[PDB]
Amino acid sequence: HWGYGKHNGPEHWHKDFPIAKGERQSPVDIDTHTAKYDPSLKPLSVSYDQATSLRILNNGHAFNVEFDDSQDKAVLKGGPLDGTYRLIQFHFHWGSLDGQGSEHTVDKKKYAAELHLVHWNTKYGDFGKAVQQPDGLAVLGIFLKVGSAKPGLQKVVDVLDSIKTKGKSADFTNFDPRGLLPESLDYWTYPGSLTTPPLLECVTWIVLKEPISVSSEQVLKFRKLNFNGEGEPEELMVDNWRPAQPLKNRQIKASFK
Numbered sequence: 001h002w003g004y005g006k007h008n009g010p011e012h013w014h015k016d017f018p019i020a021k022g023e024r025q026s027p028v029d030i031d032t033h034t035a036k037y038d039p040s041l042k043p044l045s046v047s048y049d050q051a052t053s054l055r056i057l058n059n060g061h062a063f064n065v066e067f068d069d070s071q072d073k074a075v076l077k078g079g080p081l082d083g084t085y086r087l088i089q090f091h092f093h094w095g096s097l098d099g100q101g102s103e104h105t106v107d108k109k110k111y112a113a114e115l116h117l118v119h120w121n122t123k124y125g126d127f128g129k130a131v132q133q134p135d136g137l138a139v140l141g142i143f144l145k146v147g148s149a150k151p152g153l154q155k156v157v158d159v160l161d162s163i164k165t166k167g168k169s170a171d172f173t174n175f176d177p178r179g180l181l182p183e184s185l186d187y188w189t190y191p192g193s194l195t196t197p198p199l200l201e202c203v204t205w206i207v208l209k210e211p212i213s214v215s216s217e218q219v220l221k222f223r224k225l226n227f228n229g230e231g232e233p234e235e236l237m238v239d240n241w242r243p244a245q246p247l248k249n250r251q252i253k254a255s256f257k
């Protein structure tokens with residue numbers, strides 16, 4: 001099926017997912033000078049105090065930390081959003097080298113990795129219905145650069161040995177996603193898509209200006225994961241990012257000047 005190799009990578013996805021060539025595909029390059037400041041944008045409201053993480057899963061393309069989304073326990077509101085969006089999972093995209101790995105770029109700059117905190121609009125009842133709607137999801141994207149360690153990431157890093165291969169899951173309770181946030185919640189926003197098949201055009205993207213810094217050892221541990229299942233030939237889970245797609249008829253808005 002689809003993946004990030006030579007024969008199934010992003011340039012091939014359109015053959016099974018023709019929306020790959022659609023009008024609101026993600027990620028994009030964020031040209032910071034042509035983004036328009038919008039004073040009518042509200043600050044983001046991140047309410048993660050009651051978040052309930054449940055488990056961590058290697059799905060063969062990344063690893064997802066999954067949350068209980070059966071109540072308004074961890075929600076995103078405000079910003080460009082109307083209504084309440086519930087956190088369902090977070091995951092990352094990263095590179096084989098510190099010089100690449102992010103999906104969004106900032107004036108063509110690639111970061112070492114990118115965190116996606118995935119939320120769905122509660123007016124649609126569940127994630128499966130939300131992805132069928134143009135305003136169904138809100139993904140908070142946070143860039144990772146290599147520098148000092150991020151202490152709040154370490155519990156993620158340490159469990160990865162237990163989910164090395166595709167299909168492996170592990171209990172992962174009591175993780176606080178607030179430990180992954182930068183100091184500032186200044187953001188860019190634009191309408192886009194899932195960045196993996198099925199590439200559905202259902203996402204309000206909210207990309208934070210301020211990256212978090214993680215240590216070289218932390219991101220090295222991401223690169224020890226496998227795309228393959230256990231007992232299959234080993235292919236390191238690296239470069240699981242889609243490159244920037246045409247902005248087409250879209251304007252990126254900034255919450256800041």
Ligand SMILES: NS(=O)(=O)c1ccc(NC(=O)NCCCCO)cc1
Nearest residue numbers: 001002003007008012013014015016
């Ligand atoms: N459009 S897509 O989803 O990126 C895609 C690309 C390749 C394939 N299939 C494929 O490569 N099959 C042959 C695998 C031989 C490697 O052992 C399926 C889907």
Ligand SMILES: NS(=O)(=O)c1ccc(NC(=O)NCCCCO)cc1
Nearest residue numbers: 116118131139193194195196197198
């Ligand atoms: N990288 S991203 O744009 O934040 C993203 C988030 C969730 C998903 N989830 C997903 O595809 N789930 C499969 C079932 C719903 C799609 O029919 C995919 C990509």
Ligand SMILES: [Zn+2]
Nearest residue numbers: 091093116195
């Ligand atoms: Zn993602």
